[PDB]
């Protein structure tokens, strides 16, 4: 917590002192409290009862059920001082269970923002919160992270400081799905960089000018994936620019990896891009006819492969905002036609049928042909000619007509894809022009949106394709951590014993790229006519089975439960792939003649197509390759958005769901690397204020150096020197160190309290001592004066001078 825990704004970011102190002192016993696996809420807090062999018995604490969990299932829970902890990096127990807690509990306390290493986690609250005030903005204006509580502006501001400071472009990678508000965030991050540009001292806002175009792109770049109603099947990098004075000076958008395949293939419960379906709705009939189509989506093999519509989606309305947005970016209702038409043209290329004589394919119609022939602005005859039988060279020109039916079918698909691609590239170019209302750019802070790691029940060439990417991104991350930490130690003169962290993922990655790699193999196996799915598997098995730990093999599931063919080990765990149609999907050959031929008529068309026979992988490789060269050039910043529950409802937390996100996030991968090192670090002074109690000494807490005490405190507790190292300003600890120290403090304190109590009784009683003494004298005097009296009450004489004197 930072600044004033009581300042009104910080209600959803800090945690009022009184509320903290309170939450920080709750009941605890590091000897028996614990994290334990729970079938309904992932992991739950518990108390251990007894032990025997590899079978521990325990008691939960909310539904106090006695369960018999195993030993490598008892998660050591973090002692209180870590509750509502702000940076999970600080937890002393960095286990899954624990990472869940700190996040959940904070979300269940209204807090969304949490740091976990370089990561800035953010969970969707599902409700407007104050959090983004231009008053708060100043609060975070120039403060280094540590100075303010979590929050997204910190990450974005520093991001800024670094720009002007180190003088090198900055990137912001945010992850998260659908209801992660990933969008909002990026929006708000754009807003921020804005407010700060004019915050030095003297036709639409940035945010809007950009959020303005997001609909057109979504129309061509998104769609429904098995597990997501609206999935951008491309990677967008929104670069925001600045001038020497940290001045905003413009923007522009780069795009990577558009899922081509999708234009001609659908996975049962998925869908081709949204724009296809939109066009075919009761909104702009005229076009439906300009396009040469009937508002019946299902009547086109390039669209019906999957589903028709999605739940909670009113196509029309979208076809609406889309057309409306097309004018905000404001471009010719004619271009707007061409764009559409092109789109539609894709609808007929899937219709064109074919047949063959011996081994030479010919048309099975001519309507579709002319339909595409026209929509494009070329002559059908020639097209079919160059489609069914083209002519090339050597010096002379032979009829490369080798063509057959299986070759055209593929061929036509290709065209569509390419059409769809050039199109998209274009669409973007134009929005950039919308944006280039600039002067002069020097630096930038981009924000990367990219499909996150995927794992479905049925994983195919598509899935590998994304993981491959993501896996190259986690490496991007791990590398970063590596460099930095390496600095973080040198700064504290600690010895560095670690090979670059990214290297940990090189394995898998290599098992993908390198010659004789998964993809490469796939490629070669594509140039062979009679190559079959089996002929591919074998070659993979041949080349890698026992030979590489990363490549493995699954085992037949149910009956319908798809057959798997091999699995790889991704930072996100172990994914199992099915080879099914890879041979098919991967073929994306270019048909030259079609280009040159396609270099005629209709303005755009010329332009588009106016800028061997390869595959998709080769391509995927090229883009990724580029995207990265782009990333590694920038100083990164990672935001992790997170869905808390499947049912858009505040305060709730779906364990499994969150966890899953965390593994794909990398959040868990960071902690993994964090683990192998000395995660916990303490300024001597902080260490002093906390454990002196453990090895107190006569020197006034005021003239005592931190290093020493800290030092001397450990020597005293005889701590395996292997668990910690003494820095120039902090003391680095390993997993669970502090956890012990904390519990020994609690231990010591109580003893030490029984003692003060002891010295109290010592004064209390030692004070009676004197009394008891005096009163000995008394009981004696009486006790004995009474006796001598009992003898005398009957001693004749005694009586006498007891008479003889009052008579003197």
Partner 1 sequence: SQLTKDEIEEVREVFDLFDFWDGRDGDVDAAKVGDLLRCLGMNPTEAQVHQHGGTKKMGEKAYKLEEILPIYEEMSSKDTGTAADEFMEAFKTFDREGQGLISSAEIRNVLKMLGERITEDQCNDIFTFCDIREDIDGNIKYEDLMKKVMAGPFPD
Partner 2 sequence: RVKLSQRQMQELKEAFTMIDQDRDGFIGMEDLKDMFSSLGRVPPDDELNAMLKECPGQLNFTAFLTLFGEKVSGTDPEDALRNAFSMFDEDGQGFIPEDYLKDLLENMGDNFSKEEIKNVWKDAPLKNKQFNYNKMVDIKGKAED
452 is catalytic: yes
CA 406/CA 518 separation, integer angstroms: 25
Give yes or no for residue 777 binding partner 1 (CB under 8 A): no
Two tokens, residue 490? 């040198």
Please choose which of partner 1, partner 2, none residue 439 contacts, taking the beta carbon within 5 to 8 angstroms, the exact cut-off set by kind.
none
Assign 120 to helix, strand or coil. strand
Please choose which of partner 1, partner 2, none residue 798 contacts, taking the beta carbon within 5 to 8 angstroms, the exact cut-off set by kind.
partner 2
For 522, phi then psi, to 5°, come to: -50, -45
Give yes or no for residue 781 binding partner 2 (CB under 8 A): yes
Q: Binding residue per annotation — 51?
A: no
Q: Which of 259, 454, 513, 525 is catalytic?
A: 454
On the 0-12 / 13-18 / 19+ scale of CB atoms within 10 A, 50 is: exposed
The stretch near partner 2 (CB under 8 A) out of 79-87, 486-494, 562-570, 790-798 is 790-798
Q: How far is the CB of 13 from partner 1 (least distance, A)?
A: 23
Q: Which of 116, 214, 232, 692 is catalytic?
A: 232
Of 232, 75, 100, 182, the residue nearest 657 (C-alpha): 100
Please choose which of partner 1, partner 2, none residue 803 contacts, taking the beta carbon within 5 to 8 angstroms, the exact cut-off set by kind.
partner 2
For 171, phi then psi, to 5°, come to: -115, 150
Q: How far is the CB of 761 from partner 2 (least distance, A)?
A: 23
Mutual orientation of helices 706-717 and 684-691 as an angle, nearest 10°? 50
Give yes or no for residue 808 binding partner 2 (CB under 8 A): yes
Q: Binding residue per annotation — 184?
A: yes
Of the chain, the end-to-end C-alpha distance in Å amounts to 95
Assign 635 to helix, strand or coil. strand
CA 84/CA 238 separation, integer angstroms: 34
Please choose which of partner 1, partner 2, none residue 515 contacts, taking the beta carbon within 5 to 8 angstroms, the exact cut-off set by kind.
none
CA 672/CA 676 separation, integer angstroms: 7
Assign 547 to helix, strand or coil. coil
Q: Binding residue per annotation — 83?
A: no
Q: How far is CA 275 from CA 226, 272, 279, 308, 315, in A?
A: 18, 9, 6, 13, 9
Which 693-712 residues touch partner 1, going by CB under 8 A? 693, 696-698, 701
Q: Binding residue per annotation — 181?
A: yes
On the 0-12 / 13-18 / 19+ scale of CB atoms within 10 A, 654 is: middle
Please choose which of partner 1, partner 2, none residue 805 contacts, taking the beta carbon within 5 to 8 angstroms, the exact cut-off set by kind.
partner 2
The stretch near partner 2 (CB under 8 A) out of 209-217, 297-305, 577-585, 769-777 is 769-777
135 is catalytic: no
Assign 249 to helix, strand or coil. strand
Q: How far is the CB of 764 from partner 1 (least distance, A)?
A: 6
Q: Which of 42, 75, 117, 179 is catalytic?
A: 179
Q: What binding mask, one character per residue, do residues 726-765 give for partner 1 by CB under 8 A, x or -?
A: -----------------------xxxxxxxxxxxxxxxxx
Give yes or no for residue 769 binding partner 2 (CB under 8 A): no
Please choose which of partner 2, partner 1, none residue 696 contacts, taking the beta carbon within 5 to 8 angstroms, the exact cut-off set by kind.
partner 1
> Please, where are the H alpha helices in 198-225?
206-211, 214-221
Q: Binding residue per annotation — 180?
A: yes
Give yes or no for residue 786 binding partner 2 (CB under 8 A): yes
Give yes or no for residue 558 binding partner 1 (CB under 8 A): no
Q: What is the DSSP string of 404-436?
A: -HHHHHHHHHHHHHHHHHHHHHHHHHHHHHHH-
Tokens 């929050």: give the residue.
Answer: 151
When the beta carbons of 533 and 747 are compared against partner 1, the nearer one is 747
Q: Give the DSSP letter of residue 280.
A: T
The stretch near partner 1 (CB under 8 A) out of 218-226, 537-545, 556-564, 772-780 is 772-780
Give yes or no for residue 776 binding partner 2 (CB under 8 A): yes
Q: How far is the CB of 794 from partner 2 (least distance, A)?
A: 10
The torsion angle over the Cα atoms of residues 119, 124, 127 and 132, rounded to 10 degrees, is 20
183 is catalytic: yes
List the Cα angle 686/689/695 in 5-degree steps: 120
Q: How far is the CB of 801 from partner 2 (least distance, A)?
A: 5
When the beta carbons of 769 and 797 are compared against partner 1, the nearer one is 769
Q: Binding residue per annotation — 179?
A: yes
Count the residues of the shown chain that bind partner 1, applying the rule CB under 8 A.
Answer: 30
* Beta strands 730-733; 680-683: pairing state: antiparallel
Q: What would you report as the CA-atom Rg of the chain, rounded to the nearest whole angstrom? A: 37
Whether the Cβ atoms of residue 340 and residue 287 lie closer than 8 Å to each other? yes
Give yes or no for residue 792 binding partner 2 (CB under 8 A): yes
List the Cα angle 649/652/655 in 5-degree steps: 125
179 is catalytic: yes
Give yes or no for residue 545 binding partner 1 (CB under 8 A): no
Q: What binding mask, one character per residue, do residues 729-768 give for partner 2 by CB under 8 A, x or -?
A: ----------------------------------------
171 is catalytic: no
228 is catalytic: yes
Strand ranges of the sheet holding 43-50, from the earlier edge strand across to the other edge: 33-37, 43-50, 56-60, 66-69
Give yes or no for residue 788 binding partner 2 (CB under 8 A): yes
Q: Binding residue per annotation — 272?
A: no
Residues 512-548: b if buried by 16+ CB within 10 A, e if exposed: bbeeebbbbbbbebbeeeeeebeebbebbeeebeeee
When the beta carbons of 546 and 778 are compared against partner 2, the nearer one is 778
Tokens 């970063």: give the residue.
Answer: 480
Mutual orientation of helices 96-107 and 655-665 as an angle, nearest 10°? 120
Q: Establish how many alpha carbons lie within 13 A of residue 675's alpha carbon, considering only the half-sphere containing its beta carbon.
A: 12
The stretch near partner 2 (CB under 8 A) out of 321-329, 413-421, 458-466, 797-805 is 797-805
Of 247, 162, 160, the residue nearest 197 (C-alpha): 247
Give yes or no for residue 780 binding partner 2 (CB under 8 A): yes
Q: Binding residue per annotation — 728?
A: no
CA 483/CA 118 separation, integer angstroms: 12
The torsion angle over the Cα atoms of residues 245, 251, 257 and 259, rounded to 10 degrees, is 150
Give yes or no for residue 309 binding partner 1 (CB under 8 A): no
Give yes or no for residue 782 binding partner 2 (CB under 8 A): yes
Q: Binding residue per annotation — 183?
A: yes
Give yes or no for residue 784 binding partner 2 (CB under 8 A): yes
Give yes or no for residue 772 binding partner 1 (CB under 8 A): yes
Q: Which of 226, 228, 404, 623 is catalytic?
A: 228
Q: Binding residue per annotation — 192?
A: no
454 is catalytic: yes
Two tokens, residue 34? 């614990």
Give yes or no for residue 779 binding partner 2 (CB under 8 A): yes
Q: How far is the CB of 740 from partner 1 (least distance, A)?
A: 18
Q: How far is the CB of 769 from partner 2 (least distance, A)?
A: 15
The stretch near partner 2 (CB under 8 A) out of 83-91, 120-128, 422-430, 778-786 is 778-786
Q: Binding residue per annotation — 232?
A: yes
When the beta carbons of 153 and 691 are compared against partner 1, the nearer one is 691
Give yes or no for residue 778 binding partner 2 (CB under 8 A): yes
Whether the Cβ atoms of residue 291 and residue 344 lie closer than 8 Å to each other? yes
When the beta carbons of 50 and 785 are compared against partner 2, the nearer one is 785
Q: What is the DSSP string of 167-181?
A: IS-EEEEEE--GGG-
Give yes or no for residue 781 binding partner 1 (CB under 8 A): no
Assign 67 to helix, strand or coil. strand
On the 0-12 / 13-18 / 19+ scale of CB atoms within 10 A, 414 is: buried
Q: How far is the CB of 749 from partner 1 (least distance, A)?
A: 6
Question: What are the residues binding partner 1 (CB under 8 A)?
Answer: 692-693, 696-698, 701, 749-767, 769-770, 772-773, 776
Residues acting as catalytic residues: 178-179, 183, 228, 231-232, 452, 454
Please state the residue numbers annotated as binding site for ATP. 176-183
Question: What are the residues binding partner 2 (CB under 8 A)?
Answer: 774-793, 795-798, 800-808
Please state the residue numbers annotated as binding site for ADP. 124, 132, 179-184, 228
Please state the residue numbers annotated as binding site for Mg(2+). 232
């Amino acid at each position: 917590m930072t600044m004033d825990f009581s300042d009104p704004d910080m209600e959803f970011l800090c945690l009022t002192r009184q509320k903290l102190m309170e939450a920080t002192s709750i009941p605890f016993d590091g000897k028996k409290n614990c994290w334990v696996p729970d079938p309904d809420f992932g992991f739950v807090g518990a108390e251990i009862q007894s032990t025997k062999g590899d079978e521990v018995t325990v008691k939960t604490d909310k539904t106090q059920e006695t369960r018999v969990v195993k030993k490598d299932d008892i998660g050591q829970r973090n002692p209180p001082k870590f509750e509502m902890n702000m940076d999970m990096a600080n937890l002393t127990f960095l286990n899954e269970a624990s990472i869940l807690h700190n996040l959940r509990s904070r979300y269940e306390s209204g807090f969304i923002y949490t740091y976990s290493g370089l990561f800035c986690i953010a969970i969707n609250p599902y409700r407007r919160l104050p959090i983004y005030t231009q008053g708060l903005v100043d609060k975070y204006r120039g403060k280094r992270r540590a100075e303010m509580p979590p929050h997204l502006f910190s990450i974005a501001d520093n991001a800024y400081q670094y720009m002007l400071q180190d003088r090198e472009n900055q990137s912001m990678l945010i992850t998260g799905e659908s209801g992660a508000g990933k969008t909002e965030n990026t929006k708000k991050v754009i807003q921020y960089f804005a407010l700060v540009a004019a915050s030095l001292a003297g036709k639409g806002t940035l945010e809007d000018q950009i959020v303005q175009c997001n609909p057109v792109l979504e129309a061509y770049g998104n769609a429904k994936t098995t597990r997501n109603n609206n999935s951008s099947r491309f990677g967008k990098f929104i670069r925001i620019h600045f001038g020497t004075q940290g001045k905003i000076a413009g923007a522009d958008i780069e795009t990577y990896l558009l899922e081509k395949s999708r234009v001609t293939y659908q996975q049962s419960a998925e869908r081709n891009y949204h724009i296809f379906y939109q066009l075919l709705s009761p909104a702009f009939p005229e076009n439906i006819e300009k396009i040469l189509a009937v508002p019946d989506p299902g009547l086109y093999g390039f669209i019906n492969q999957g589903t028709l519509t999605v739940d909670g989606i009113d196509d029309e309305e979208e076809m609406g905002l889309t057309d409306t947005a097309f004018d905000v970016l404001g471009f010719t209702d004619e271009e707007k036609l061409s764009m559409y038409k092109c789109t539609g043209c894709i609808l007929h290329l899937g219709e064109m049928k074919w047949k063959q004589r011996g081994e030479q394919a010919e048309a099975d119609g001519t309507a579709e042909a002319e339909k595409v022939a026209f929509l494009l602005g070329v002559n059908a005859g020639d097209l079919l000619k160059c489609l069914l039988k083209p002519k090339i060279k050597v010096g002379t020109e032979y009829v490369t007509q080798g063509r057959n039916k299986d070759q055209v079918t593929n061929s036509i698909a290709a065209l569509a894809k390419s059409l769809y691609d050039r199109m998209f590239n274009w669409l973007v170019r134009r929005v950039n022009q919308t944006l280039d209302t600039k002067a002069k750019r020097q630096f930038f802070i981009g924000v990367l949106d990219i499909a996150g790691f995927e794992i479905f029940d049925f994983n195919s060439f598509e899935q590998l394709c994304i993981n491959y990417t993501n896996e190259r991104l986690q490496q991007f991350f791990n590398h970063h951590m590596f460099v930095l930490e390496q600095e973080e130690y040198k700064k504290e003169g600690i010895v560095w014993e670690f090979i670059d962290f990214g290297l940990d993922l090189q394995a898998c990655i290599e098992l993908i790229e390198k010659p004789m790699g998964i993809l490469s193999i796939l490629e070669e196996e594509c140039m062979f006519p009679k190559a079959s799915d089996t002929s591919f598997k074998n070659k993979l098995y041949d080349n890698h089975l026992g030979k590489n730990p990363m490549f493995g093999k699954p085992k037949p599931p149910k009956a319908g439960c798809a057959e798997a063919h091999f699995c790889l080990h991704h930072y996100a765990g172990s994914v199992s792939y099915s080879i099914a149609g890879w041979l098919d999907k991967n073929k994306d050959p270019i048909n030259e003649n079609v280009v040159e031929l396609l270099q005629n008529s209709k303005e755009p068309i010329v332009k588009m197509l106016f800028t061997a026979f390869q595959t998709i992988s080769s391509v995927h490789k090229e883009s990724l390759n580029k995207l990265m060269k782009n990333l590694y050039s920038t100083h990164p910043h990672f935001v992790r958005c997170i869905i808390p529950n499947e049912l858009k409802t505040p305060g709730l937390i779906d364990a499994a769901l969150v966890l899953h996100q965390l593994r794909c996030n990398g959040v868990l991968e960071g902690i993994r690397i964090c683990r192998k090192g000395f995660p916990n670090r303490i300024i001597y002074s902080e260490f002093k204020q906390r454990y002196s109690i453990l090895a107190p000494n006569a020197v006034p807490s005021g003239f005592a150096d931190g290093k020493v005490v800290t030092d001397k405190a450990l020597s005293a507790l005889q701590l395996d020197p292997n668990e910690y190292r003494l820095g120039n300003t902090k003391v680095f600890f390993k997993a669970g160190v502090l956890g012990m120290l904390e519990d020994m403090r609690d231990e010591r304190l109580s003893k030490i309290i029984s003692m003060f109590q002891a010295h109290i009784r010592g004064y209390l009683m030692r004070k009676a001592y004197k009394k008891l003494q005096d009163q000995r004298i008394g009981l004696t005097l009486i006790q004995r004066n009474v006796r001598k009296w009992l003898v005398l009450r009957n001693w004749e004489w005694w009586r006498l001078f007891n008479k003889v004197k009052p008579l003197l």
